[PDB]
């Protein structure tokens, strides 16, 4: 019940002497579905306590590594020292189709490679020569973005002027993003700045152009980052219904799709946290309605497909019914094969924003009860959405400390834990099966009916692996 959960929370917090305990008590809570506003029990979107080994990232990670990186035909310059591009290079599986180095540059690392002279005297002229060199060596690029790492915002470099001058000179769009790491407390502000850059530099280049033929079935997938091909599966599912997916970004995204987005009739937002800003802006300016959708699990997929078909004519509704009837036997077979091997298992998740609350439907579709979820950068609305779907008497955490996660797992003792790479081996050494909830553990997709089979197979292969039974030596 709640008494033991609160006792465990207090016991874990006892380590923090005076102030860290007060800060961390606010981010730990116990679920209650009757609560609408999560601000009464949990507090998020706050600065992290120093020296606690947080798992959050920076604004540069949320801008370059999340929103702008997946755009294939654009060249993204990590303005600053070599480190951040190096570490952010190809470490995220935002899949795409293109020839790398010619018309695709997702896995490439472009940087200004700041030195001491650049720090002391600035790097605006270096950025100008950067842009000319990029244009001469990569002529098929369709635009350049300039993601600012820490030193650039610190030394007061003004890259908007050089970006505008170069855009005028070479007649190519150049998007300056001030995504310095010190800004904000996590990757969420990186999403906000990247969204503002898209709004102010890309979204309105065809506001006076009407050469695009439009159909009443025009939709745009917003916030689908094609992590292992989730966007492709969702897109095939939506096109089997008869809807034209005109735009798809950032995952497998081109600048042309972003430019054509204002012409669609609906905005299907997958990740609310990372693109709600542009969703509301497109509702306000162009009058395009948007909805949240969930393709993670057959039940949630069916519900989302029916909801999307609700606001089109009868043809679209009947095509949605036909798609559901077509894909029903496949996920029924997946459930039949994999439910007996997973019924009753307990899961705890700590991933990020949208995913920790959206995986719940397919986790339950296989019969596995979820007893704890948490975020690192989500806002209060994310928790408000989480309360309804999450079950009662479950532990919720924000900005988890590695110590906190360690001693929470040592008490709850679940059968499976889904988190990032920085906890994979920590939890592996404890005998608890682990799944990389972002990397999908170098597998996927997990979205759509096709992704449900892979998700079930991966859950089975990790949860019932023999290696988890051999951690204790027979003589010990």
């Amino acid at each position: 019940s709640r008494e033991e959960v609160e006792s465990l929370i207090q016991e874990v917090l006892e380590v923090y002497p005076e102030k860290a305990r007060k800060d961390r008590n606010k981010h730990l809570a116990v679920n209650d579905p009757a609560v609408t506003q999560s601000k009464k029990c949990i507090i998020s979107n706050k600065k992290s306590q120093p020296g606690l080994m947080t798992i959050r990232g920076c604004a540069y990670a949320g801008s370059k590594g999340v929103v702008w990186g997946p755009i294939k035909d654009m060249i993204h310059i990590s303005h600053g020292p070599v480190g951040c591009g190096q570490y952010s290079r190809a470490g995220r599986r935002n899949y795409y189709i293109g020839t790398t180095g010619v018309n695709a540059f997702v896995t490439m690392n472009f940087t200004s490679d700041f030195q001491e002279k650049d720090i002391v005297f600035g790097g605006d002229k270096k950025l100008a020569k950067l842009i000319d060199e990029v244009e001469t060596l990569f002529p098929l690029n369709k635009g350049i973005s300039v993601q600012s790492e820490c030193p650039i915002g610190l030394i007061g470099d003004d890259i908007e002027s050089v970006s505008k001058v170069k855009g005028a000179e070479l007649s190519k769009t150049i998007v300056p993003v001030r995504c310095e790491g010190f800004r904000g407390v996590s990757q969420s502000l990186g999403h906000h700045i990247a969204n503002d850059a898209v709004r102010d530099w890309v979204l309105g280049k065809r506001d006076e152009d009407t050469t695009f033929a439009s159909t009443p079935y025009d939709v745009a997938i917003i916030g689908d980052y094609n992590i292992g091909g989730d966007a492709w599966s969702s897109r095939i599912l939506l096109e089997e219904m008869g809807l034209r997916c005109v735009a798809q970004w950032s995952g497998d995204g081109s600048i042309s799709e972003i430019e054509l987005t204002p012409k669609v009739k609906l905005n299907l937002v997958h990740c609310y946290r990372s693109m709600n800003y542009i969703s509301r802006h497109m509702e306000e300016k162009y009058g395009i309605p948007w909805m949240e959708y969930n393709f993670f699990g057959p039940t949630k997929t069916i519900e989302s497909l029916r909801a999307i078909a609700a606001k089109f004519d009868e043809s679209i509704q009947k095509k949605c019914e036909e798609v559901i009837a077509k894909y029903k036997p496949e996920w029924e077979a997946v459930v039949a094969k994999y439910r007996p091997r997973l019924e009753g298992k307990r899961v705890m998740l700590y991933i990020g924003g949208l995913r920790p609350r959206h995986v719940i439907g397919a986790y339950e579709d296989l019969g596995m009860e979820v007893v704890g979820t948490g975020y690192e950068f989500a806002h209060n609305d994310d928790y408000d959405r989480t309360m309804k779907e999450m079950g009662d008497s479950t532990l919720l955490y924000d900005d988890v400390t590695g110590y906190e996660f360690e001693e929470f797992v040592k008490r709850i003792k679940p059968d499976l834990i889904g988190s990032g790479i920085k906890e994979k081996f920590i939890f592996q050494k404890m005998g608890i099966p682990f799944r990389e909830m972002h990397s999908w553990d170098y597998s996927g997709p997990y979205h759509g009916f096709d992704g449900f089979a892979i998700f079930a197979r991966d859950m089975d292969m990790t949860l019932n692996n023999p290696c988890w039974k051999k951690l204790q030596a027979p003589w010990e």
Binding site: Q49, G51, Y60, P81, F182, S256, K429, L471
Partner: protein, 522 residues
């Protein structure tokens, strides 16, 4: 459509006909893709010599670098001391990236904390971040030493780490006796190896500067070993094993092998092994200090010679035959202990393997890259094997190191077609292997993309990659390997000769076309 019996992951599920039709529609309808003939023309242009001339005229753009920033090496150095917590003064995204990098290489948990400095600390400094973070890190993780490195935010503002730590001790956030050494690791100067050097110098300074009055050189009959930035656990293990075989006392400083290879037995061990504080304090009493990678341990060498008054030997990295022989002979001269029969037998076995594989290793052309000391050791070993290193790339190398490597190449007739490039990146090496094709590349995982590019020009133009170096992300447990000493040379020789033979078998597998050379015995 997914069949329940044979579930397909992304490959080759996206090879299905419906998916191809959907991607084709997406590309043709709204992507505004350039025509494919233009793509082919631009690719062929990028593989040309004129593109190489344009690429080598780069002065402001770096594409696909082969180096990292200082705090990563500082964290790796700090991980090598007992119950030590790496503490980065600056942003938290840096620590997230360092942890991700080291997890993806070692497949292990890596412990590092940050003080989480924000925009406020950019106007008023990071003093309170230091105090609160040091207190919290001491409270919840209970280390015996907190080793403080910096992030570029902290270097641009100009935070005084010494004053910050001293004030934190004075107020009462940490006990005055608690070891908190520090080092300045600017990311715009040098690379991760420089960060390792700075961290080691800082730790040595903190533990030895104000206690040199009672120190006598050689009073404890031990040899200090400083390994530098090392990501192969086999290297630490082999150094310890060969120094124990000779029966010489050693004190390996900054040994992280235990925390990087913790056993999985149902519990998480955040700390394991490492160099003790007593060892670090007793270091000035040793006979001498030997640096395995002197080309990025310059400031450590300066501090050891100036303060500890140790006549540091001029030794190259113990890679290959000759340099391992020089290392062993110098250790024998310093300690007075003769080289035993086991080491001689192991050297003879390496020579035997060389005699066995020389007919396959001769004349092979290699493009290799990595860290300065590792690259120079590999070049030396390749010269001993009769191979021809053609493209030697070191992004973080300097003019003096290039001159040393050129002198090494001049000593052998196999360095005639060798050019050493410093300050270049993997795009330069892509151009070099397209224009001056080698037989193989030797480098980290980032080279795999280059291989793909070569395969796009044609099978005959492909340059296979051999994964030796840091980081290796697409293979498992290669970090347990060895590169130093006779054992490391044996492993490198086996890797090289097996790569050559596997490539030869691949090229001659076609039936009735190239199968006449598909020999059972090679």
């Amino acid at each position: 459509s997914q069949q329940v019996d044979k579930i397909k992951a992304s490959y080759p599920l996206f090879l299905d006909q419906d998916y191809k039709d959907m991607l084709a529609k997406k590309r043709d309808g709204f992507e505004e893709k350039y025509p494919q003939d233009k793509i082919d023309e631009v690719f062929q242009w990028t593989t040309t010599k004129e593109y190489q001339e344009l690429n080598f005229q780069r002065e402001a753009l770096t594409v696909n670098p082969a180096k990292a920033c200082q705090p990563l090496g500082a964290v790796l150095c700090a991980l090598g001391f007992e119950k030590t917590m790496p503490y980065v003064h600056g942003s938290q995204g840096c620590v997230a990236y360092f942890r991700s990098y080291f997890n993806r290489h070692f497949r292990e948990p890596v412990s590092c904390v940050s003080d989480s400095m924000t925009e406020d600390a950019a106007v008023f400094g990071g003093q309170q971040n230091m105090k609160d973070g040091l207190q919290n890190c001491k409270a919840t993780y209970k280390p015996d030493m907190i080793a403080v490195s910096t992030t570029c935010m902290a270097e641009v503002i100009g935070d005084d780490l010494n004053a910050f730590i001293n004030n934190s001790k004075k107020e009462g956030f940490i006990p005055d006796e608690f070891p908190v050494p520090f080092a300045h690791t600017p990311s715009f100067v040098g690379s991760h190896v420089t960060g390792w050097d700075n961290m080691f110098e800082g730790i040595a300074r903190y533990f030895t500067l104000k206690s040199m009055d009672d120190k006598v050189v050689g009073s404890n009959k031990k040899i200090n070993i400083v390994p530098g930035f090392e990501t192969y656990l086999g290297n630490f293990r082999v150094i310890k094993r060969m120094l124990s075989e000779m029966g010489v006392g050693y004190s390996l400083l900054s040994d992280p092998e235990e925390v990087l290879d913790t056993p999985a037995d149902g519990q998480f061990r955040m700390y394991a092994g490492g160099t003790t504080q007593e060892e670090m304090k007793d270091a000035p009493n040793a006979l001498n200090t030997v640096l395995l990678q002197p080309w990025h341990l310059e400031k450590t060498k300066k501090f050891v010679e100036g303060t500890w008054k140790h006549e540091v030997p001029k030794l190259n990295i113990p890679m290959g035959l000759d340099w391992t022989d020089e290392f062993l002979m110098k250790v024998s001269e310093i300690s007075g202990q003769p080289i035993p029969a086991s080491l001689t037998k192991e050297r003879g076995r390496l020579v035997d393997m060389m005699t066995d594989s020389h007919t396959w290793l001769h004349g092979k052309r290699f493009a290799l890259w990595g860290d300065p000391d590792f690259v120079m050791g590999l070049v030396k070993f390749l010269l001993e094997l009769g191979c021809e290193p053609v493209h030697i790339l070191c992004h973080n190398g300097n003019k003096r190191w290039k001159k040393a490597v050129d002198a090494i190449l001049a000593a052998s007739p196999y360095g005639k077609n060798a050019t050493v490039y410093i300050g270049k990146d993997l795009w330069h090496l892509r151009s070099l292997v397209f224009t001056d094709k080698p037989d193989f590349m030797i480098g980290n995982s980032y080279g795999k993309f280059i291989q793909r590019d070569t395969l796009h020009k044609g099978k005959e133009f492909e340059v296979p990659l051999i994964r030796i170096g840091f980081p290796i992300f697409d293979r498992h447990h290669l970090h347990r390997s060895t590169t130093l000493g006779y054992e490391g040379a044996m492993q490198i020789l086996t890797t090289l000769v097996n790569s050559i033979l596997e490539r030869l078998d691949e090229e001659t597998r076609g039936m009735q076309a190239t199968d006449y050379n598909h020999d059972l015995v090679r």
